[PDB]
């Protein structure tokens, strides 16, 4: 008995199957992250990714920024997080402009790990990525606003 | 052609990042570009010379402007050996309060850098006396860079 | 088989390892909320202009209207100026 097996039974594809790669917990959890929901409108997946990251980014900027000890304005350091979301929404935007063209189809795989044919994820399409950037921006600024909305009764505010 | 760099097909057909680097490092090597002739060679050189002259005039124009705006030229003429000439003003939002304190010198309101190019002595020796004279020279060189 | 000149996506491993392909877990109403309010942001060209200009004007506003209580560069020097090694 052995634990490490070739990637999907093919030894000549550059990868391996390990508990980190191929495991029911890892496979399910990654299959349930919004970036891997290959049948959902990319606008909504962008909303979730934007909400999670915009919410997370507020913490470090507020607690480590220059105005951190000047409590008069340190709570407004979420603006820096919001500015990074703006910058990242530009990085996301300019990425799709160069990667996918208007009439180009999806570059995502049109297969399944079991061989059956599949409908490619619309995220690797020009309009799909545009919806994801718009969703990430909307959820991003919403995540920063909602994170700054909370401030009190926390051990590290 | 087909993509950057438009002057080199072999660089444009590079599938790696090497396409970008060599496209920048060979922009002025006119003789290696595709479909170059002796006429296009001398003509691109001629226009590059004009662009350089425009760069030089604009650069000197900016130097006059800051000396006349944030500088010490009018005060430096009165005390040539007791006034530290000012290059320009410093506006760095990363400055702490002491950085603003220690960099405020030469008799200015904010932090300034002490000029060490000698344009103050040069301009005083040739007849320039007021900040208005430096503004006039800057406009003329800005206009010369334009032509 | 693993080598099939017909389908090279299966031959070269062009698979979706962690794609779910399941229907949407996001319920309705909520999705329509985001699909109508995040609608104008999904034009990548318009979003690019909106981000650059909007972000640049936001940066220009908070920089032009800065405060001396927040930035030492605007507060300026509060101490009397020092004296150079020989000059002013």
């Amino acid at each position: 008995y052995q634990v490490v097996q070739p990637i999907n039974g093919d030894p000549f594809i550059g990868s391996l199957e390990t508990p980190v790669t191929s495991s029911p917990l890892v496979a399910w959890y990654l299959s349930n992250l919004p970036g891997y929901r290959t049948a959902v409108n990319p606008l909504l997946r962008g909303i979730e990714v934007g909400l999670a990251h915009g919410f997370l980014l507020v913490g470090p900027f507020v607690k480590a920024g220059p105005l951190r000890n000047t409590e008069i304005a340190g709570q407004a350091g979420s603006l820096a997080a919001g500015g990074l979301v703006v910058i990242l929404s530009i990085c996301l935007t300019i990425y799709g402009i160069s990667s996918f063209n208007e009439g180009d189809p999806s570059t995502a795989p049109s297969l399944t790990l079991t061989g059956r044919k599949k409908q490619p994820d619309q995220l690797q399409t020009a309009d799909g990525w545009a919806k994801f950037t718009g969703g990430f921006f909307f959820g991003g600024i919403s995540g920063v606003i909602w994170a700054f909305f909370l401030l009190y009764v926390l051990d590290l505010p | 052609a087909l993509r950057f760099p438009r002057f080199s097909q072999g660089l444009a057909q590079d599938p790696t990042t090497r396409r970008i680097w060599f496209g920048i490092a060979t922009a002025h090597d006119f003789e290696s570009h595709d479909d170059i002739t002796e006429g296009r060679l001398y003509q691109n050189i001629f226009a590059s010379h004009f662009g350089q002259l425009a760069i030089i005039f604009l650069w000197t124009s900016g130097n006059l402007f800051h000396v006349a705006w944030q500088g010490n030229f009018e005060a430096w003429v009165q005390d040539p050996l007791h006034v530290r000439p000012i290059a320009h003003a410093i506006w760095d939002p990363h400055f702490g309060q002491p950085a603003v304190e220690a960099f405020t010198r030469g008799g200015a309101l904010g932090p300034v850098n002490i000029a060490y190019s000698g344009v103050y002595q040069w301009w005083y020796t040739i007849g320039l006396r007021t900040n208005e004279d430096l503004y006039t020279g800057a406009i003329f060189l800005l206009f010369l860079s334009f032509i | 088989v693993y080598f099939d000149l017909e389908d090279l996506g299966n031959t070269t491993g062009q698979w979706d390892l962690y794609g779910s392909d399941a229907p949407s877990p996001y319920n309705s109403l909520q999705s329509k909320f985001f699909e109508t309010f995040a609608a104008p942001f999904t034009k990548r060209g318009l979003l690019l202009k909106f981000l650059i200009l909007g972000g640049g004007s936001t940066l220009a506003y908070f920089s032009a209207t800065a405060s001396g209580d927040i930035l030492p560069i605007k507060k300026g020097p509060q101490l009397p100026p020092q004296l150079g090694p020989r000059l002013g």
Binding site: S98 | L2, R3, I20 | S63, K74
Partner: peptide, 30 residues
């Protein structure tokens, strides 16, 4: 007051627009 407008306009906005536009041109295809 003018530095509070032009210093970010050349150290933040200008490199942002310049790097993004050069990225689009370099990665463009015909």
């Amino acid at each position: 007051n003018l530095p509070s407008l032009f210093v970010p306009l050349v150290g933040l906005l200008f490199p942002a627009v310049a790097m993004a536009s050069l990225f689009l041109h370099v990665e463009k295809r015909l």
